[PDB]
């Protein structure tokens, strides 16, 4: 599913991402825009052979099982295909564990490079929340 900006903001709020570990809603919406362009079905292959899955592009090396990443871990305890659903629950739940791992939102490269330090509140402007 391709989410609208304000609609994904609404769903993220409902799942308790607004201010999670100190990160405003605008940060999560910006991260999703540049990771996947709001597309839940977005996949991308990494040079190390792992794959990134879904709206927040969760990595199969550490976080999910896709059955083709030798030596990998599955810290979120779900199949990677679960992260591609139109229901964002499993993605949001896995994101929470990642953001609590010590490095905050830096774990997402597109957030570090394109959202961090910017006016992220622009991403929820005009939205009914």
Q: What is the CATH number of the domain that holds 58?
A: 1.10.530.10
Burial of 90 (0-12, 13-18, 19+ CB in 10 A): buried
Q: Which residues are annotated as a binding site for substrate?
A: 101
Q: Is 119 a catalytic residue?
A: no
The answer for residues whose C-beta is within 8 angstroms of residue 21's C-beta and 6 or more apart is: 96, 99, 100, 104
Q: Which residues are annotated as a binding site?
A: 101
**Which of 52, 59, 66, 119 is labelled catalytic?**
52
The conformation of residue 88, written as its DSSP 8-state character, comes to -
Specify the resolution in Å: 1.9
Q: Is 35 a catalytic residue?
A: yes
Q: What is the C-alpha to C-alpha distance for residues 129 and 119, in angstroms, rounded to an integer? A: 18
| 53, 80 Cβ separation under 8 angstroms | yes
Name the experiment that determined this structure: X-ray
Domain tally for the chain?
Answer: 1
| 45, 53 Cβ separation under 8 angstroms | no
Q: What is the C-alpha to C-alpha distance for residues 11 and 87, in angstroms, rounded to an integer? A: 9
Write out the residue range of the structural domain in which residue 22 sits. Answer: 1-129
Q: CA distances (Å), 96 to each of 15, 48, 69, in order?
A: 10, 24, 22
């Amino acid at each position: 599913k391709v989410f609208g900006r304000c609609e994904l903001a609404a769903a993220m709020k409902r799942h308790g991402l607004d201010n999670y570990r100190g990160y405003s809603l605008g940060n999560w919406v910006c991260a999703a825009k540049f990771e996947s362009n709001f597309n839940t079905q977005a996949t991308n292959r990494n040079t190390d052979g792992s794959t990134d899955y879904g709206i927040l592009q969760i990595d199969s090396r550490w976080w999910c099982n896709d059955g083709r990443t030798p030596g990998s871990r599955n810290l979120c305890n779900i199949p990677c295909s679960a992260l591609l659903s139109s229901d964002i629950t499993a993605s949001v739940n896995c994101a929470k564990k990642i953001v609590s791992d010590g490095n905050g939102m830096n774990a997402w490269v597109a957030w570090r490079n394109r959202c961090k330090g910017t006016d992220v509140q622009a991403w929820i402007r005009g939205c009914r929340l």
